[PDB]
Amino acid sequence: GSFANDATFEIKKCDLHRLEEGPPVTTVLTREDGLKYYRMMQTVRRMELKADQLYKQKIIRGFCHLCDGQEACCVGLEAGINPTDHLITAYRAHGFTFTRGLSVREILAELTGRKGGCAKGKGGSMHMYAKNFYGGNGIMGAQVPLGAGIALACKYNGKDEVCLTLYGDGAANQGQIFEAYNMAALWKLPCIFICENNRAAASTDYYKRGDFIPGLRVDGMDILCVREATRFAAAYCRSGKGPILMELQTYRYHTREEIQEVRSKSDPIMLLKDRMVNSNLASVEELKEIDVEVRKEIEDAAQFATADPEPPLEELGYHIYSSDPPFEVRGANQWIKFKSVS
Amino acid sequence: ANDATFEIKKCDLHRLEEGPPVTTVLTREDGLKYYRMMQTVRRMELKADQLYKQKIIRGFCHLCDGQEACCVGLEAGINPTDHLITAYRAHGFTFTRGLSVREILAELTGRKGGCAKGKGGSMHMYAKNFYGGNGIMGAQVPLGAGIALACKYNGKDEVCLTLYGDGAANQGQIFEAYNMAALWKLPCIFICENNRAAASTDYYKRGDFIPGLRVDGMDILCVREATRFAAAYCRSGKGPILMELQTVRSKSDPIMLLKDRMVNSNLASVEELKEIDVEVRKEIEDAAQFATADPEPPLEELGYHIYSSDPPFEVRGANQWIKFKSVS
Amino acid sequence: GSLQVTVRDAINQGMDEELERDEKVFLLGEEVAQYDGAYKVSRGLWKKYGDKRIIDTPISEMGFAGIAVGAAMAGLRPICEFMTFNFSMQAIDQVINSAAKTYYMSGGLQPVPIVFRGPNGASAGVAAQHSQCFAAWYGHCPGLKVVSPWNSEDAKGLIKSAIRDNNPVVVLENELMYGVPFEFPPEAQSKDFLIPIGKAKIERQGTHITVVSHSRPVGHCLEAAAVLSKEGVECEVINMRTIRPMDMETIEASVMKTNHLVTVEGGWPQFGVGAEICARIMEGPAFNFLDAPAVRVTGADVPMPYAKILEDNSIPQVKDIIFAIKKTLNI
Amino acid sequence: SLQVTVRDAINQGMDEELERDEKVFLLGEEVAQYDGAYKVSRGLWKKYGDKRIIDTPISEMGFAGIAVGAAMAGLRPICEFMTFNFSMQAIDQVINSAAKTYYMSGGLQPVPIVFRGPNGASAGVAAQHSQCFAAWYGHCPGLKVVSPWNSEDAKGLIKSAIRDNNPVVVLENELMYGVPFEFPPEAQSKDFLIPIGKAKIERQGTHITVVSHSRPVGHCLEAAAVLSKEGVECEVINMRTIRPMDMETIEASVMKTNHLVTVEGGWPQFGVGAEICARIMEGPAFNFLDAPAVRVTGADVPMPYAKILEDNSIPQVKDIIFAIKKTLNI
Numbered sequence A: 001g002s003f004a005n006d007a008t009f010e011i012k013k014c015d016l017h018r019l020e021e022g023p024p025v026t027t028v029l030t031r032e033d034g035l036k037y038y039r040m041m042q043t044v045r046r047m048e049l050k051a052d053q054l055y056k057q058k059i060i061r062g063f064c065h066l067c068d069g070q071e072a073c074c075v076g077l078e079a080g081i082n083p084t085d086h087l088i089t090a091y092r093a094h095g096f097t098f099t100r101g102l103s104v105r106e107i108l109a110e111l112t113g114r115k116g117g118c119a120k121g122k123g124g125s126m127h128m129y130a131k132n133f134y135g136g137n138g139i140m141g142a143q144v145p146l147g148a149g150i151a152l153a154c155k156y157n158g159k160d161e162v163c164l165t166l167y168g169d170g171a172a173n174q175g176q177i178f179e180a181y182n183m184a185a186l187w188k189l190p191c192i193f194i195c196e197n198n199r200a201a202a203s204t205d206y207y208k209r210g211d212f213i214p215g216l217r218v219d220g221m222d223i224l225c226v227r228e229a230t231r232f233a234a235a236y237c238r239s240g241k242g243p244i245l246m247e248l249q250t251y252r253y254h255t256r257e258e259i260q261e262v263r264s265k266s267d268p269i270m271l272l273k274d275r276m277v278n279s280n281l282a283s284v285e286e287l288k289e290i291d292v293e294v295r296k297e298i299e300d301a302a303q304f305a306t307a308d309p310e311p312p313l314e315e316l317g318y319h320i321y322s323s324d325p326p327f328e329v330r331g332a333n334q335w336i337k338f339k340s341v342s
Numbered sequence B: 001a002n003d004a005t006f007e008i009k010k011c012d013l014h015r016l017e018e019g020p021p022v023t024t025v026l027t028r029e030d031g032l033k034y035y036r037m038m039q040t041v042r043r044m045e046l047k048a049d050q051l052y053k054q055k056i057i058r059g060f061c062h063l064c065d066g067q068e069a070c071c072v073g074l075e076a077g078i079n080p081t082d083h084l085i086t087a088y089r090a091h092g093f094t095f096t097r098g099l100s101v102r103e104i105l106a107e108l109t110g111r112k113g114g115c116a117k118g119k120g121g122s123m124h125m126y127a128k129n130f131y132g133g134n135g136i137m138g139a140q141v142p143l144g145a146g147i148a149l150a151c152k153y154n155g156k157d158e159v160c161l162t163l164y165g166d167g168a169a170n171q172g173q174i175f176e177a178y179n180m181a182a183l184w185k186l187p188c189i190f191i192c193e194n195n196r197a198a199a200s201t202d203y204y205k206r207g208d209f210i211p212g213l214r215v216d217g218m219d220i221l222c223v224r225e226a227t228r229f230a231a232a233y234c235r236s237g238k239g240p241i242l243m244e245l246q247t248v249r250s251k252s253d254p255i256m257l258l259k260d261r262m263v264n265s266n267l268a269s270v271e272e273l274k275e276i277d278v279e280v281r282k283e284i285e286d287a288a289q290f291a292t293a294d295p296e297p298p299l300e301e302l303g304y305h306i307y308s309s310d311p312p313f314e315v316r317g318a319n320q321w322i323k324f325k326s327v328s
Numbered sequence C: 001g002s003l004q005v006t007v008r009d010a011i012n013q014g015m016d017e018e019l020e021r022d023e024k025v026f027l028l029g030e031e032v033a034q035y036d037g038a039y040k041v042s043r044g045l046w047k048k049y050g051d052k053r054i055i056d057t058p059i060s061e062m063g064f065a066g067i068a069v070g071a072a073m074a075g076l077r078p079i080c081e082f083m084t085f086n087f088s089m090q091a092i093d094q095v096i097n098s099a100a101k102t103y104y105m106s107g108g109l110q111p112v113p114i115v116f117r118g119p120n121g122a123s124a125g126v127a128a129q130h131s132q133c134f135a136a137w138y139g140h141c142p143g144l145k146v147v148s149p150w151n152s153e154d155a156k157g158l159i160k161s162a163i164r165d166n167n168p169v170v171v172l173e174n175e176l177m178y179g180v181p182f183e184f185p186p187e188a189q190s191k192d193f194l195i196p197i198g199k200a201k202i203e204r205q206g207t208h209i210t211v212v213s214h215s216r217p218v219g220h221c222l223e224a225a226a227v228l229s230k231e232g233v234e235c236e237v238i239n240m241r242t243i244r245p246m247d248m249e250t251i252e253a254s255v256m257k258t259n260h261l262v263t264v265e266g267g268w269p270q271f272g273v274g275a276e277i278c279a280r281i282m283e284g285p286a287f288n289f290l291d292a293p294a295v296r297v298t299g300a301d302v303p304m305p306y307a308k309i310l311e312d313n314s315i316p317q318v319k320d321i322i323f324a325i326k327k328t329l330n331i
Numbered sequence D: 001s002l003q004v005t006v007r008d009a010i011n012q013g014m015d016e017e018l019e020r021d022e023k024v025f026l027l028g029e030e031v032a033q034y035d036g037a038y039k040v041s042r043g044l045w046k047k048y049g050d051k052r053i054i055d056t057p058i059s060e061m062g063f064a065g066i067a068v069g070a071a072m073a074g075l076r077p078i079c080e081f082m083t084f085n086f087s088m089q090a091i092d093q094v095i096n097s098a099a100k101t102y103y104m105s106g107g108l109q110p111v112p113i114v115f116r117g118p119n120g121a122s123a124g125v126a127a128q129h130s131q132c133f134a135a136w137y138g139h140c141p142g143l144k145v146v147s148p149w150n151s152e153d154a155k156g157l158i159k160s161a162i163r164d165n166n167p168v169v170v171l172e173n174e175l176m177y178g179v180p181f182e183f184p185p186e187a188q189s190k191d192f193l194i195p196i197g198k199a200k201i202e203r204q205g206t207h208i209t210v211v212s213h214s215r216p217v218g219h220c221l222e223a224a225a226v227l228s229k230e231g232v233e234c235e236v237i238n239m240r241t242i243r244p245m246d247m248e249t250i251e252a253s254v255m256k257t258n259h260l261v262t263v264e265g266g267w268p269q270f271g272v273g274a275e276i277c278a279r280i281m282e283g284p285a286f287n288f289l290d291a292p293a294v295r296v297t298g299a300d301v302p303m304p305y306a307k308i309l310e311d312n313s314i315p316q317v318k319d320i321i322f323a324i325k326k327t328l329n330i
């Protein structure tokens, strides 16, 4: 019946590329941060499991890429940056939308295409935006030059902000990424290129693909190992040394495909759970109490996303241009006219 | 003298343990052929420059003077059955790949006697196993990888040389071509023509997993030997390879270097190389007058050659009453 | 002796028969081999022909499209698949500048026998970046041939003609049509079945109004024609099949009988397929035969929204075709 | 009044907007120290420096996406393509990343950006450097597409394009860069703006409406001046904006002239003229047509190199007069 305020942990050593010294191999996790990181990861988990359920029920249409098993990435990266920093990723943005501040109600309602969604039902799974969160992007590789441009604006405004620009390993051969490498290093943009490797390409050492840009390969199932590398990479960009490449090694949960041998040994929520209990940062009963609250909050949000009505037909043409006067757009024929409002 | 051995610069290597030899044998016959070929390309680009300044040539006219050791050196290291493709600076390669000076100049001046009947101009000239110049930078690099794919597809041990300038070395599609060429072990020789906007100027290293070598592009003998090495590499099945050619006139002219080498080793006399200069210079003036006196292509052939192996049809002109006949 | 064949199976039959016919033909694209096709169109092809002929490519559109065009220049006959045609925009320079214009610039020396195929246009809940129709864009460019099949006959006959043509051919398929079955007559089951590029097909004889469309909305035009037929209005539904060069003689000959014209398309209205048909009917010999102006039925003038109610109203529906037809006929 | 070339008028526009708003910057190939590939951005780098006038490598898809990214982050870039033929490498970023983004976000993420550069035919640049992209970009919702002709058009539209909070494509013309025009004091002002979406009547007429955009507008004025000596008064209309085009001005003209001819530089099929003809037929002016509207376009071929062939692949003054006389049965 006594709780330690903090505890020191040994973190995995990152593989380096064109770097003499890397992130520290020890870090301090406080009890408050541990409980915060745990609740955030368990929320992302139960949110993706609920989305998977709605997708099977065909309530969600089109695309629905889930990030379960990568909770240490979106939560670990957020713990290593500021809310005034910038982040952009591809089509698997459900976790990042929640970690960057949007509610589970907004995310699920958008997935179900309802008026209560964060994009008013206009975007769906792949196009969710938030403050300093430049969303998911459906065209692979396209978000990498976009993030480099956000980093250009970070340097342009000179407020020592950075941009995290994520892409999966399947997008790592998009030519525009190599064009973005050269410009980011040429202009020393505060851009952290993050390759989300899930475990096609002649080289699988994605942290070395920037050639002239230094890189570090990180274990993405350890949230503390991701947090320390993010703090290292963010400080690197804030010093004016230019861009940096960061490979997060993770695994997705979505017979031979038994692969309980990833949940049992490497699940990011279970790893943070075991670390906090052995170091007396929290009790098993405490973390079960958090699971119950989170599951109730997701079912309450899923209930909202299911009962919430569709967007009104009168708003089909809304928000085509910004800061423009109202006009009409043509429908299925010349007699169908939708009003368009900024 | 029948033959002579020459010292060539040692190439800087990337992911290669052994490189091209640092000595080579040049025969008298090859020397006179290389000299005449280089001197012809030189006088041809200077004549085009005059016509371009005289506005007889329109639009674009990128000259390759000073790079004569590249196109002639590369041709000496490959076979006529090999394949080559480059960007917009293709006048020299058009001549080394078999087209005559008359066809090249007449095409530059936009006359019916041009190799493309005046339809393509400076940037779009094609020849046998020469897949031409290309106006969009970098686009020719994936094309060469596809020609190498056909080389592997047909399995007759042919290779493809794919050239791009240093200004195009940051085109994303080049890195897409790198990854697929090594993945499929394509017999593609990526050649970056470096002269003197890029975070890395070690262009022979940009292929990362693809091995590279940096070559002195002003020495024709060094280009020939590096090309033979790269061609043998691709023919052995080891996949692609990257080759950087670095390309003042007082001690770096490629013609002046080969001229001094052959005279010092008694491979040729000063009088012979001057007589070749006269023969070459006469051939350029004869081609230039033909390109100037030759009439433009006829207007009746404006729509010709839109589709291949198709029946004839008519295309719309400036208005619906102008109809140009189109024939394959 | 007819069979029930899906459009997906008809394309698969076409590509399979052309691969066996000419060893220079090969298929490359994302997931075309071991995954059996992103939409299962190339199922079984890799097991039959191997790594040499069915080539899995990385996600590098500009790169492997250019590789296909390069292989075409060297004498091969590639089939370059884009997973959807939204992703072809990354490679569109290779289609236009490297493939379409080359034979003309070469003075008739360098032909480019290549096929660009893949689904085009709207789907179901895939949002704005995955719903664009590129029929007008590719049809705008000389040196290309652009086709847009509808049913199973269209798909197999056009895909075989596209492969045998010595020039760049764009085949704009439709995902929602892949799983739709049609009666497949014995003539289409043959390995010699060809549908010529540049000729449209009349899917329904009519005398009151000419309805021209391509791809999936052709089925909606037939549904509208069946509804209006119970009211005494005979529609002549025309399936373009080819976008460039389109068959205007067939449309003109129909208008000379019906005196009314309505075009139906899935893509965006401005500078679209219907705009060319209407402009061509006004410049042509059929203009004096119109008893009413020709009207266009298109998709809504917005990026494709996600919500079901919004997406349903951004695409021509059967009631939208009937509405435009009754406006033209003043009934 | 001063003699100002279109190239100088664009330079005045960008300079005034850079001075007005520090969030505006220009990036592209050779825009800085080379003073511009066509000298359009001359002196801008010497005035503002590396921070605001950014020379980029030859990486079209790369720096166009970088421009859009900076625009999402709150800046107002000016992204120059050396010609719009090279924009095809970056057209995915223009369409999917910039045009469609505000709509998909539900009104949360605007993209204030300008894509400018010469468009269409030139002189001897062959097929890959002569393509016109007016119809392609005008086809896409979420974009605004303009195509200036004279110096007033260029400065007024480039300033409206920069101040608009949405992606604007500015299709310039290389052969118009060096052409001088009378520049009135109203155009010399720093507050001179031409609104996007309204056309300008360059010549009043009563016998036929002639609509065009970009360089061929001048050829229509030459054609109208020749026909005026024959008793035919042409009403020449300068579109200025491709999307959303000003059909009300064209319709009002057709209702007076009863005849319409469209003239454009790009390819005929699915081009700009095709949309204008469809809109008058769907519109209220169709009953006022006493003759079908005809399209004057470029030849339906890849642009050839030879001087005689390229001259016949571009609308000439005699081609406009011929189509006009066909419409009037004279």
Ligand SMILES: Cc1ncc(C[n+]2csc(CCOP(=O)(O)OP(=O)(O)O)c2C)c(N)n1
Residues within 6 Å of the ligand: A065, A138, A139, A140, A141, A168, A169, A170, A171, A198, C030, C059, C061, C083, C087, C090
């Ligand atoms: C430029 C581009 N090319 C192709 C695609 C099609 N595509 C989307 S996601 C994807 C990868 C397969 O999906 P998933 O199962 O999520 O694998 P991951 O995304 O994890 O690689 C592909 C090929 C695309 N969206 N964008």
Ligand SMILES: Cc1ncc(C[n+]2csc(CCOP(=O)(O)OP(=O)(O)O)c2C)c(N)n1
Residues within 6 Å of the ligand: B062, B089, B135, B136, B137, B138, B165, B167, D029, D058, D060, D082, D086
């Ligand atoms: C993909 C592409 N982008 C832009 C251009 C426009 N462009 C043509 S040449 C050139 C720079 C080359 O100039 P120069 O020094 O004469 O040729 P180099 O020495 O670079 O071979 C540019 C930007 C192009 N041709 N292709």
